[PDB]
Amino acid sequence: SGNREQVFPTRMTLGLMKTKLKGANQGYSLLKRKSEALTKRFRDITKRIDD
Amino acid sequence: YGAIYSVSGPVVIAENMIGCAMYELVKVGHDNLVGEVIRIDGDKATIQVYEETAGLTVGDPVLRTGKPLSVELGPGLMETIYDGIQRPLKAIKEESQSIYIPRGIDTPALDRTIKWQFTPGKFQVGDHISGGDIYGSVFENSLISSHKILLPPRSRGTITWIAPAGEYTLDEKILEVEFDGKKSDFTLYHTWPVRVPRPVTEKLSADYPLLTGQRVLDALFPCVQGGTTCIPGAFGCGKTVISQSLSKYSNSDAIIYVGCGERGNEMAEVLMEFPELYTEMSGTKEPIMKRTTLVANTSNMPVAAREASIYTGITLAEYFRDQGKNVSMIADSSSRWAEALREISGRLGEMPADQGFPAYLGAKLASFYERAGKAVALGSPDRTGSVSIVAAVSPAGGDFSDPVTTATLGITQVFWGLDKKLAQRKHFPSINTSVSYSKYTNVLNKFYDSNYPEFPVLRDRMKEILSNAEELEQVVQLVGKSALSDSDKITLDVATLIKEDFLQQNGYSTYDAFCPIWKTFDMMRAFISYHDEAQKAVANGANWSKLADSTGDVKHAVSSSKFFEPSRGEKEVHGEFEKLLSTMQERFAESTD
Amino acid sequence: YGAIYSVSGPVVIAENMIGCAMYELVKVGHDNLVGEVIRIDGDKATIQVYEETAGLTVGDPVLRTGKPLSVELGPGLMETIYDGIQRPLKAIKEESQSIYIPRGIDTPALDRTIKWQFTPGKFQVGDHISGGDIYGSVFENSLISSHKILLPPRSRGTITWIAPAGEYTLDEKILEVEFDGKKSDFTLYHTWPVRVPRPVTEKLSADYPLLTGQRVLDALFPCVQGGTTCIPGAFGCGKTVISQSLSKYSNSDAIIYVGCGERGNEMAEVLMEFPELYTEMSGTKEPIMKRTTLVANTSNMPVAAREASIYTGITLAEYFRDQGKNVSMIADSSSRWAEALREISGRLGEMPADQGFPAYLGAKLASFYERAGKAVALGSPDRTGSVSIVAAVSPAGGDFSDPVTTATLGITQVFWGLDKKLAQRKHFPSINTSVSYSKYTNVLNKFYDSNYPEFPVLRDRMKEILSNAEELEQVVQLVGKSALSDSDKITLDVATLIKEDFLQQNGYSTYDAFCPIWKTFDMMRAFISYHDEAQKAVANGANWSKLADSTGDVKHAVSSSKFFEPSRGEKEVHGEFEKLLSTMQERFAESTD
Amino acid sequence: AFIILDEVIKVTNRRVNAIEHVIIPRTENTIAYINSELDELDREEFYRLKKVQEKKQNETAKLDAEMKLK
Amino acid sequence: INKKAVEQGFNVKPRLNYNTVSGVNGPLVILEKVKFPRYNEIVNLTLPDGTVRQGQVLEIRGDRAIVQVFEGTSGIDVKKTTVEFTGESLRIPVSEDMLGRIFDGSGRPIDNGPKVFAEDYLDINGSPINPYARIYPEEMISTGVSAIDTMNSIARGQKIPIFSASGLPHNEIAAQICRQAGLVRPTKDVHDGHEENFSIVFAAMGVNLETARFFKQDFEENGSLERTSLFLNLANDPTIERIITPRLALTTAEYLAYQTERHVLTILTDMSSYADALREVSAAREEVPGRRGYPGYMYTDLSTIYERAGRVEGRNGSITQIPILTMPNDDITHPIPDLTGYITEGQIFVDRQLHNKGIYPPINVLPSLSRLMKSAIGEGMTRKDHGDVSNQLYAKYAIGKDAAAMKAVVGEEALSIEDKLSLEFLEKFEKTFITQGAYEDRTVFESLDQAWSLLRIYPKEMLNRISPKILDEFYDRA
Amino acid sequence: LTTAEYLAYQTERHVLTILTDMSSYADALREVSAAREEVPGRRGYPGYMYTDLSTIYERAGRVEGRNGSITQIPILTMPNDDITHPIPDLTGYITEGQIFVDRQLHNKGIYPPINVLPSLSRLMKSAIGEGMTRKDHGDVSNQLYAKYAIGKDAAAMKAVVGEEALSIEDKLSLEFLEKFEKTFITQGAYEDRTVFESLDQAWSLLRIYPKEMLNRISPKILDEFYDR
């Protein structure tokens, strides 16, 4: 059921995967707003090219 | 009668309890602590004590009451605050003059000192009477003009003596029957076990809407008199608005609030704001407490009380439904009741099912929720009541994977999905339309076609508009407004108008405290007409930006349409809605030139 | 003798059982329900009934036979449907015309009325005959033309009288021996305790393949005649289909299909299909039902009989191994055996090990699986047989962490892991190549070098291709098809071709239900040649993008190579595959110019 | 900037749709399935232990009551 | 008549009624001094208030017999309770006229009519069918649903439940299937078509009153009420009683099919409620939990329910079982759908994601399976292209789902032309082939033609699963 | 709590109750439970301590007839630093809000290392007002929370888009977060700040921002406090 890491289910691995999930989530948000800044500058540069 | 053996907290092994039945309440110790038998083994009865057990000696008596956990049903039930065991918290306070609840206190659930005016019914001496038959009415309050006196179920016979018109207390005998020679004495009240539903002649299909007065609820996610509703009982979400609207403006002839396992200072709010909630449905301004009973349980109340609170509330609601009164039951947090079940199961040692919850949690929830619904009451005269359960689930910080939340969402037909964020943005009543749903839309088609035929079509159109805007906001954020077609801008503008006008109801004002279903329907016609006229005009080549800068006056008229005062009269408000529609049609015709 | 003292599910405790022993067959109740002792506590002995236990009363006789659970071995085993206690289901239905399995029915396991033609063996009067000696041959089937009547093991002596050639039933005396003064009689059949493995002269190393006909099983993860194979997968993966295809198309001389706790429609399927399918192995076109015997125990049939079913099946397999026949055992689901053990243990009250299974489950599994390997049969004339145990495992939830799978993995040499995702795409047999393995690959080099010398090399080549494409695919689905080398794209496309046209096997189509080893080898060679030639052409100047389109005909040809009829013969199929290889060679030579 | 934005948006979409949407089911499996099953097996084993202990002590108490009666 | 003549039913048998109640614990009542207890006798408990509830012995030990009470043990007093032993295991009065009657989960009529005027008192949870006497089901029944005819075909006598969750239209799909179930190639014995109808038998376990009313009303609208027998065990009904309800339904299905030769279509809704009843009973009995608290014997008992299906050699009846189970959290890995999938010859998977997309019926093709589809399709029955077309539909649907997942991360532009074809196929598939009217009845041939129209999106060369013989016949205008 | 009940509800005192190391009490409770041969519940802790923690916690609040009150500040150490642990979970069920002590703040040398983003006082709004502290308490607290969250987000982007690519609000937010954490949150172990001193320190921190985007302060309060 769904994609799986196929990892050893233990409390240590549970904590490891919770930390990994938090890190990946904050990285997703981090890159999302980085990409927001980059696409804002990209739209600006497209306007400069256009005119 | 009995004696005591092994005591480990509430579990209390008794002695010489030969005649005790399973799940029978008993009085434990010299303080007469309440407790129910959990096991029987010969003359030994395992009793779980319904409160603190620190002082109990071996050998001191345990008297068996002869009845399971039951609630005293009768007049005086209105305007009373109870716990799960239906202990009158007020009466306990004045009787003991005490800040706390004394251990082993046994004040009667219903006041025995109040003298009630009793008007006998159609039944005379020698008439055969059956359970549920109304043999008298008692003027309880001004809101409850006649608390009809039901003959208890499972009891029937020939009426041998009935008290004449007069003023009586509960202990005084009122009616007398003979079944087969055996003679029974019936009084102004009776006790019914909480865990057996009150019988009805027929469980009807709930098909009349529960007009909560909120536009979003009454329009998009409608509940039904006798329906079932689930709510997320989080903190920041404005669930107080929902509870106060159901207890203040709904169609219900009675309100049962069940504060099971709530916090100490949350029950303080619930008990302190309710006395000043007032209604105009009676034609005169009267408190809702005249129509409402509260079941209040702080988290330190005994586990048995917290577990039995919802059953006590639903039994009271069934009792008032059996009189023909549409009653709404609001559960503060069914998750607290499930926690009480988990504690009870753990202390009994039953094997868990889902991270500690007992194997019967789903069964108990389904059986309890099935007690709700429209039904023809037992006995004569013919009458129809309804019990609507509006239960709030509050799991561990929104962890809606909780089996309690899963089972509740699988049982309840309506989910009103309050959102924390919508409360942060001050968008009351803060209903998250994206996740909220109602499965009573199909059933209410009868009511709509009888009264407001276009209501389902407009509701579906509003659903589609909001969903389209919701799914199009992502493409807006990703690409820019320039990528949007004119019709997409129409959808966005109309949806924003909906969010700011129709879904968002002030509630604390005078024009938005109670939006009736007919005014709601008029507003749906107005909004859908606006969207349709804009769509048609723009499909006729018109640029949407020019219309938006030009048709702001009709948009303002639609915005002020929520300011129409419902108290002005249905005819007057309908006429002014017709003027609004005529004006908007004319102005669209002018601006589309 | 004894009387029932307690009944709780399949477990029955009988008192007055002072003289009974562990694992001793006992007749329970007035219906003489079959069971065996699994515990003794003084005069009370616990019995696991092999039949439905409903209706047993305390005090009814529990006869103890004195013998363990014994299976009759002799002519008549083949072409027969059996239950766990080896009751012939056909004879049950004939004797009791009801469509059900009547409890306590006592049909003789082997038909005592058929007159078998008996040809005496090389032994004459006065010879010293020992356990496992062939003292005669019997025409059982046209396929099993010489069912060799072995002397029972654990018995030896001097031949006193031997029956001449003729027709004898199983109750007629055939051989007479004299051990040390005691004179014993032997017939066509002899009973053997199903729990003690049949003795052999020596367990040889299995080094000949069990050609099952599946391309992936034969190529990548081959089993051997005498090997132990596990096929774990979720429901719908297709383990029973793989098992049935093996039973139909393997190179075995006998099949023991044990439906251990699986649906009865599978037994109906095999009963209605096997007589319709034929093998040339005996030298003439003859039905495979003449070669297959079954032990049927549907999932609703008694639980302990599930445990008995594997043991009667494996003892039948050992008996046919003792005749020098390469017999294959298929256990339809050994996880059902494990659940039967778990249920019996839970009734017994034993402390569980993991997921409720008894602590001795791994020991039982190992003891059962060790009865597989190729061995020199006991006694003379010298002969060699094998028992290929191909047992499907059904883990709960599809997780291979299941205790049955974990225990079985450390015991079996072949692990045909099934992938649920591949089965959902209907990509059968859906072997999970990334986890599946076979430890008989090194042993089979001796066979390959003699028959298909390049087979192991191409097998390793395809495994390398598949693993490379798997890591490539995860990388791509993380980052996209861009920045891939043309060699990487060739690897991905070739592995997709493999997964879709070589590992694929429709199992029910005429062309590819059975893929003979030579056709599998030719397909292996063609696919590897396609990969190698695409890699070389792209490496030598060409580009993959226009090469794929310019040479789509050869890709379609290797795709259609699976549509070659195996009935055309090895000569025709190999000639056409060589034509395909030459056409691919010339097309890739010309297209890269 | 087009190249950088395409790579960054691809990485973000991958994290949203595959990385996080596989780590969350992996964590859900780990805790909700396996840790709950291990706790459940410990519960069953300790409850069977308690049942054995209570039946043994109840038999001892019955024997003591019987010899007191005798 | 002589076969019916032998009855031995006139032998009256006095019953030992015991006041020797010893203990009550949970749903279990213990009785001492029982004279020769039988393992699985039914008992009648006269409670002190006079009410009589129904019990069943689960364990016997010498003079004591452990009794479970179907309606719960509340109010049972050692001093006053009297226990009468029927002497035999649970039986239900059965007859052909018992069709068209509504019952509780304990067999008591609730249609305000008479009690069952019996022809035989069939033993409950009847003995398993001899695997030699079975006939392999290979007679397709056209359910009118393209998601269940072209792919996931059902043949008469197949166990095939509906995998779903709370809120999805599983019961509407079941109502449709019972509404338009019929052989693809009917016997055509007579133009009346009276014996061609399915004799539905419906068992409701732990379902709300709304679903019971829905099923009753749907059977009424189609004239099926005269042919269907209902066993209603609603949410408010006792939980221990949910165990015997499917047993009663399957016993009457066996009587109708294997004794009166009726093609019975058994519906067992909310098998998850039966599972919860089993779990509650097991936790009461402190038995070993298999997984997620469910009993270790869950597989065996569920199979005992499910395996009472198929058709038998000399008898022209059949029991086609179509249970409905609510997946607790859309998990196949949950024990209820897992064991059911292990037992029940396939499953028709109702999908939440498809339902949210507005598709009806929301049958997810990939998780769905039909084990004995393989023999119910082909040349003699349906059409020679059925199997290959179904396999190619599965392959292309899987490829389309994978390509949509790829597009979710790498955008639509990066997709190959095959991926774009696969998205086109998935969209048209879900919205024009799976999507079907609630009252629309598509013959298997119409659905096959629609499947071929969908498959013609791909050029002939990439339809690899379809054999060349079929592909050179049906790909060009069939 | 018996002493607090006596004082508050009979002597009519305002009583603050600090129950430090509630986790150690939970460990003791588990030991007592397993001493009675009870089988442990979740995470070895017995399943009934929601009741016992409730009995401890609910012995608080102010009452009708007595001018006294009980305020409780339980202090529990999260084992392995997770909220999903039974003790913090049950305490969150029974208690109004929570104060968070952050290890990351502690390692930076900030005392008290109170992380204010997760910490919440559910019924804070009842403790603040015109006759209750100062009229600006609520909106100053809201503005501090908003600007602190914005500062944390801008600190995340400081190492991803660069300092100069941030917006002017983000440049102000980095230095606001600096001054906040190391002057306002950072308070000496013996530095007693009255609520008004803390409020005007918060104002001095908020005086760096412009009028336009101090948007979560009411314009009346903002125009009466920010502009001088």
Ligand SMILES: Nc1ncnc2c1ncn2[C@@H]1O[C@H](COP(=O)(O)OP(=O)(O)O)[C@@H](O)[C@H]1O
């Ligand atoms: N190799 C195959 N070729 C064609 N169809 C298959 C193959 N394997 C399985 N199937 C189909 O899938 C179903 C798998 O069911 P089964 O073999 O019983 O799996 P399991 O025993 O794991 O439940 C079969 O009924 C069959 O229709």
